[PDB]
Amino acid sequence: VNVPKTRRTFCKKCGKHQPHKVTQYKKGKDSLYAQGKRRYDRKQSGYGGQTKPIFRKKAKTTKKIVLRLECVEPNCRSKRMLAIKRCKHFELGGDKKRKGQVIQ
Amino acid sequence: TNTKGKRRGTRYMFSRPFRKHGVVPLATYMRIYKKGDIVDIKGMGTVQKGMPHKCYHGKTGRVYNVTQHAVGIVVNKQVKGKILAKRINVRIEHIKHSKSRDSFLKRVKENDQKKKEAKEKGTWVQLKRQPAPPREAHFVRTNGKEPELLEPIPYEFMA
Amino acid sequence: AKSKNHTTHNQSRKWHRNGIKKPRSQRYESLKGVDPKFLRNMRFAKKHNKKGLKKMQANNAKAMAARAEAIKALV
RNA sequence: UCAAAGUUUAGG
RNA sequence: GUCUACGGCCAUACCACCCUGAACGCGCCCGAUCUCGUCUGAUCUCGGAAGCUAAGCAGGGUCGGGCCUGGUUAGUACUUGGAUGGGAGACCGCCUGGGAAUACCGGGUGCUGUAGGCUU
RNA sequence: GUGCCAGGUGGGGAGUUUGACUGGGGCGGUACACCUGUCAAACGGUAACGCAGGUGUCCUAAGGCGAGCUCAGGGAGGACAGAAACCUCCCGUGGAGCAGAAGGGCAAAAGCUCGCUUGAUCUUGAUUUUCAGUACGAAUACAGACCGUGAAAGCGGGGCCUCACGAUCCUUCUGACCUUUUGGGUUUUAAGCAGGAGGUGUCAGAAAAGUUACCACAGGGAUAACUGGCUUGUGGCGGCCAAGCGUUCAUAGCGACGUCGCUUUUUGAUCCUUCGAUGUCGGCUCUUCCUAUCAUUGUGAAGCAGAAUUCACCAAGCGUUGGAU
RNA sequence: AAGCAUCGCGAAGGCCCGCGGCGGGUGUUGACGCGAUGUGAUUUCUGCCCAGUGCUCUGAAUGUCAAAGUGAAGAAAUUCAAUGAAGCGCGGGUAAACGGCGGGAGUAACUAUGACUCUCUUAAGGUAGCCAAAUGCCUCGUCAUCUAAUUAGUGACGCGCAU
RNA sequence: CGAAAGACUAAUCGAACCAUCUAGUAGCUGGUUCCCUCCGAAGUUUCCCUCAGGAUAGCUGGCGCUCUCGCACACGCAGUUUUAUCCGGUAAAGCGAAUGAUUAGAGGUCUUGGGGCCGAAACGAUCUCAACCUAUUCUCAAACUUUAAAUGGGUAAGAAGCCCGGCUCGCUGGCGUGAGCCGGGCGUGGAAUGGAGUGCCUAGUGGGCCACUUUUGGUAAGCAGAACUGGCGCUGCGGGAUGA
RNA sequence: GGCCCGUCUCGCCCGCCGCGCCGGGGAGGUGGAGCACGAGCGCACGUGUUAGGACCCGAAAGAUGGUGAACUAUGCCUGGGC
RNA sequence: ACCCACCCGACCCGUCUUGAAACACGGACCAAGGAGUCUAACACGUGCGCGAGUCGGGGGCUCGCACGAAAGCCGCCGUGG
RNA sequence: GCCCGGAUAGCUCAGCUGUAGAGCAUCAGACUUUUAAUCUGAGGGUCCAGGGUUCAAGUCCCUGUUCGGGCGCCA
RNA sequence: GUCUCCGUAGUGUAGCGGUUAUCACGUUCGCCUAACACGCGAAAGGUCCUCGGUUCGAAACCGGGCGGAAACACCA
């Protein structure tokens, strides 16, 4: 798929519709001092081998793409997650395809 | 094992009849349902917004809600052992007034006529219906001409 | 060791032991699932029925007096 | 102060 | 009798060719300054009113097609329920009630609502 | 060198695992989550490793409005131009197109071409579909916001409709001058609350390779390997018809193309019986039956001169041997 | 089993035990020895393949690579940085290490085979030998012999299912 | 320990024997103790590393309650039928109607051809076979259909109904709608039958099989798989000699 | 219909030792195992469901600590025999 | 109720099973033994007491306990549930 | 996921912010009787893609797409 | 029967959806040689196995046809 980099959609903070910059979202680095990770650390320590399960059976071959809609009006700048249907091709601002033209 | 899809087996049900395709002619839309109108559901292929499910086609029920361009309609759907009165939101195009009730109202109106009159008279009149009684005693005049004899016809092989 | 896969053989019988009862109709069913904008307005209408009471009571007394005058004229 | 270069009517 | 505008049901209203149309309409028609739009004033938009019913439109016509509706097909095909009926089977007959569809042959060929004309 | 941490190596050793359905199992498939048409017995609902197929995507427009058009095919024309290029007139109920399977739906559209767009946005509940009438997904009607588009009425909170998807725990991002971070206060940190994302396709969601003929235990005739039943496709044997063959002549003997049977000395189907065991091939030895008759008795036939013979009938009394591998 | 052949070790060593010890076995031993594997007297041989999996050799020239240690910013928990052991990679050797060892077409003045040629291909493409063998599906292979008769026996043949 | 057979290790070895943890666990075999009485199933649902088991619906029982009136003075409910009224795309039928299949001749230079024969060649003459077309004609369809049954599924057949009068609305709107409230006025509204409603606890079951008819796979089966009702299972008795 | 808590949306006012990024209320939806003149507590019996040896009997296994080389396996010492 | 006769009827029980007289298993015979227990927790039903309460434990006061390791009482009567 | 590398003309590779290097290959000149062999010249780079820093980027920066050697692995 | 792959000038093979279909041999035509061979220079030659589909476009992607060739066919 293709989506454009600007989007005039709703902005919760402002209450109106407003232009938002768009960008595809990423998982951050994984804290290390989250209760989860702190818990797994002190469980997984010692002997016992591995303690919680390990996923080794991947079925799908694509992620639901998410956009990160950030509000353009300053004094707000409010970011927002916006998911889209799964697709094994994605891009932002990748031409406008053009009806009625010569393919070569 | 069959597919659970919503529209499975409605090849014929939701299909406009022969030479009645195209524009949904306008009376359909512009006739008014109130609360508690008896209404028979009949899905239609042209309009796919607000279609009822194939189980409620044919089924009659009462209107409970009326929105802008649809009508909430309680209908009874049987499920193995239990009849469930349940409420569905059909778009007008899939719905007619069921006449079933009007013949009743006609009769009650006729009764109210025949109750007001025949009160000052004194002669009480049959308000209840009655099933078709045995066909009474009567003469049949074989007027002049006698009966016509019917011999069964002798077999022959045609094909 | 394959089974029987599916059936409906003894089921009608099973259902009809205890009836197949029709769904118990009451008068005064709920207004659950009625178009919200309606329900607000009938709620507000219900709110202010006590406003316009004194007028209504008098109107019925005037009606009752008119009925009593009509029945006296008949008798 | 050394590249590669095989063959040749039966018909006198 | 009939039309126009907006219609309802949507062929008894469709298609083909043929004939006839008073008045009012409806049209074709004549123009592109402006509005509007085209490669093109053909369409679309706009300003008209010299011509004409040729066409559209209406009404009719056709041993017309089509559609609509009856008959026939036929109590036939099928079929609910019945029997320690038949039949080697395949299938069939009866009882008990229900009952179609072509070909073929007739008839029909828009009705009508609201608002406004014309035939004064 | 020893002591203690760190990383590597480590079937030498340990523990454990090694799906399911399945005409026994294994092999192969997936009928394991979905969708179309059929099966399906004219409400709905219905099975098999039934039939014919499709799905794990694709789309910034192929979503949302509004405008204008008309499509497939065919005819007849027109420089180069031919069956096919471009133009023009006619016919054209859709025979085209509408991302994909199929079904439905669709013509001043739901098709094509433009113009403007982000309703594929924010937020409560109700309902439908699977249904237990729980979830998920998918959908329907509203309602409140903020927009789009159109002169407007309206339409639009994704794809004309029917499939395209995923719980708890954990992570990650976004959100509020939000709550807690504990004797109190400020600050980092963490923990909450609310919504998206990271996946479980065995798709209501374990984290998982073999082998055993050295084998074990609980059971199973819910289930294979014999017999025996049912069946007889396949094998075996037998009619009917009669185009041919038989120098000539359908039928002495035969018999195509067709057809109707019997048989259980073939092999399959099937799985009813037996898994707290019915001793699993062959040969030897012995008895008895069957006839679908090789010989022997009595006979009909011939394409029977004799001899040799094949065809048929009564018929199973009596026989049917010795060896090499 | 003798015979053959590999491999490890010069003792703070090879190999191995042990819960632990300035523990123990080989070892009252020292390479004509100790330890680990194969093959299996003699005779005669022992072809090619280091691509794969093993084993092994080298090592700042160097990718990655942990804890500590070093620096960095921060109020600090800290984060980020540079640094960088073996091991992996990178590069040599090794088959008496595990093991492995092809397929099309055309071609000789009767025909047939095919010395010969042409390709496509691998780490090589099965060499000497041997054979329907205790190894060959087809198979009761073909020829010979052995018998009156031989799915047997022997001797030959060899695109040999699969030496 | 083994000159290797997984051999031997006190009749025991692919891990000795003794005691304990131990009454180890078992979705699997087996058994499970007196009488009468009354009611009386299921083998189907969805979910499950589920398919020899659970869960959940269903089917059973028990406990009740709330009302009803044979105490001349009844409402409601149904494995019916009646009268109205919708729904349907199976049987049949159809293919001179679409889709697809398919026979034959008539007719047609439609097209055009490929092969001919008579032609240099010529829509010239004559045939021909290709596809296409004009009327006809033969024969078909689980995944075709213009038609279209029987059996079948909804509703409805009144007091929660009719008919008047007036109030409330922040909804809707030229005025009006539509809804919600008060207050009166009117009674048997098809046949047949039957006392109804309602709530808690709840076991067994979740291997099924058989027949009519319908029906898929298969040459067929005492084969495998659905529908519909009724059986057998749970059930004796008369008949069918014998027998679910 | 109403009230309470959570939550959202929209709104307009009140309060005072500390006027504040203070505190309090209103209208309309919507989540709550709520309120709306109480029904519990204790004791006893019954049925059901579980955890326990858990209706009774049944494994193959697993773990801890001990006993055996009088058979047999192999080494060594000392004797015998052909 | 003991024995005998005769007519009619009449396969062996238990069990798993769609189906058992089965060529399905267990069972020569008799005696005694022999399997739904107890504790805890929950839920519903029922009986009793008290009732916006109720409660009894645990502790204590009354006896050498014959009967008692009971029975009685407690601003503990309610810490507390 | 983390580290690191390559991507440049047909191919293999140099490149220190200011006509893109080398060699081969490609095509025209010599040599050849000619061909090959070899010597001369000529042509040929979107410097993988996009954005920035910069007066100026093939390089610096970030971000992707690859590549391919190690690390790593909780729904 | 299953699953798999492969069908390209005369021969053997390359081929990343847009090619004049690549290379070698073979073929013909020159030259060189006395002639042949080698050698040098030129040329010609594909039904891309068959049909249908998707595609603006298929030698390839997808379906079925007709061929061809490996592996499986086990416990009794």
Ligand SMILES: [Mg+2]
């Ligand atoms: Mg550690």
Ligand SMILES: [Mg+2]
């Ligand atoms: Mg079952």
Ligand SMILES: [Mg+2]
């Ligand atoms: Mg004009």
Ligand SMILES: [Mg+2]
């Ligand atoms: Mg005219």
Ligand SMILES: [Mg+2]
């Ligand atoms: Mg005229």
Ligand SMILES: [Mg+2]
């Ligand atoms: Mg006519």
Ligand SMILES: [Mg+2]
């Ligand atoms: Mg192991």
Ligand SMILES: [Mg+2]
């Ligand atoms: Mg299985």
Ligand SMILES: [Mg+2]
């Ligand atoms: Mg039906």
Ligand SMILES: [Mg+2]
């Ligand atoms: Mg339009």
Ligand SMILES: [Mg+2]
């Ligand atoms: Mg669309």
Ligand SMILES: [Mg+2]
């Ligand atoms: Mg809205």
Ligand SMILES: [Mg+2]
């Ligand atoms: Mg402190």
Ligand SMILES: [Mg+2]
């Ligand atoms: Mg073995």
Ligand SMILES: [Mg+2]
């Ligand atoms: Mg074996």
Ligand SMILES: [Mg+2]
């Ligand atoms: Mg062994």
